[PDB]
Amino acid sequence: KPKLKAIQELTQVHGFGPRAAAALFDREGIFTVDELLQKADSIPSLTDQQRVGIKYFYDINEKIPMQESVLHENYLREKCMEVLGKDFSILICGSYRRRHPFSGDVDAILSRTLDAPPLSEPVAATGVLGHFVEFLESLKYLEATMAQGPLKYMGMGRLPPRINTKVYKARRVDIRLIETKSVPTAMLTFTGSKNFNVIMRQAAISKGYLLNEYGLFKLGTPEEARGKNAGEELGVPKDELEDKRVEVRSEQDVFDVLGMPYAKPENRDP
DNA sequence: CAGTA
DNA sequence: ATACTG
Ligand SMILES: Cc1cn([C@H]2CC[C@@H](COP(=O)(O)OP(=O)(O)OP(=O)(O)O)O2)c(=O)[nH]c1=O
Numbered sequence A: 001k002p003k004l005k006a007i008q009e010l011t012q013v014h015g016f017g018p019r020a021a022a023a024l025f026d027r028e029g030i031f032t033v034d035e036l037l038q039k040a041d042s043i044p045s046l047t048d049q050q051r052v053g054i055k056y057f058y059d060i061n062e063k064i065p066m067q068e069s070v071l072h073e074n075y076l077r078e079k080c081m082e083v084l085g086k087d088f089s090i091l092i093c094g095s096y097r098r099r100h101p102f103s104g105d106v107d108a109i110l111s112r113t114l115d116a117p118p119l120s121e122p123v124a125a126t127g128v129l130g131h132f133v134e135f136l137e138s139l140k141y142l143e144a145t146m147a148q149g150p151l152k153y154m155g156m157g158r159l160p161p162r163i164n165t166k167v168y169k170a171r172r173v174d175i176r177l178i179e180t181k182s183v184p185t186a187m188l189t190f191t192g193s194k195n196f197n198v199i200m201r202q203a204a205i206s207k208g209y210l211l212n213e214y215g216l217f218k219l220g221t222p223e224e225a226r227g228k229n230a231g232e233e234l235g236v237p238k239d240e241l242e243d244k245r246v247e248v249r250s251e252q253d254v255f256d257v258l259g260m261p262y263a264k265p266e267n268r269d270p
Numbered sequence B: 001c002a003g004t005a
Numbered sequence C: 001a002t003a004c005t006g
């Protein structure tokens, strides 16, 4: 049992799951978070992402008050306009959009507007997420990176000091780049809650649909339906899946097609 | 697969 | 339930 308490302890750190916690206990004799923090630098196996979880342990365990999330929203929207221009927009989802007084992180969607001209390739292929991230890094807002690819960024963002002088904690910031036609389904997914998404996706299954952030897809009967995911690359469904899309313009559209009563974001905590 | 949205 | 990065 000694290593069971250790695992439950060590998995409190961002980037450490049961597997990594066991290795720490067995190969390092480390059994407390406090020891992990004091020793991390002398452990070479740790990845760059685990190192961020350790360095920002204090900040990461503090919740963000709604008033500060409003400031992150305004900041990201302004910087988006400055460096990407009017073709793009930022929307903050997660527990903030569900109107919780506190949130664990900042969940942002970056997407092209309905008015922006259509592209000839997936928007992710333009490198735009990386350009936006570099801009935020030059401003010293983004100060550490956990993971980054062409669709999803996870890092630590800190609002600049405001003038007495107010100094802010670094916060977990997640940015997802989403195609225009996928925005209504991405708003559903990234607003959650987690349990709400599972319930709605189960409802889809029962009616012969696939629901994800990219769309609502009508698969048909259980047999007609029959490797990384259901069939998307760079944020775009493969043609065979795209052909199944039921176009939607609003969250309400999705509730309606699935025969579920509409719920406001603040009522999505089952 | 591990770990996190 | 379904998905992205390492
Ligand atoms: C974990 C998880 C999350 N999601 C969606 C649904 C929510 C958003 C945000 O995730 P968060 O963990 O930040 O959720 P949040 O509700 O924003 O709460 P915090 O206040 O940030 O903890 O992602 C999911 O589909 N499957 C999952 O396993």
Ligand SMILES: [Mg+2]
Pocket (backbone or CB within 6 Å): A094, A095, A103, A104, A105, A106, A107
């Ligand atoms: Mg969140």
Ligand code: NA
Pocket (backbone or CB within 6 Å): A010, A011, A012, A013, A014, A015, A016, A017
């Ligand atoms: Na963890």
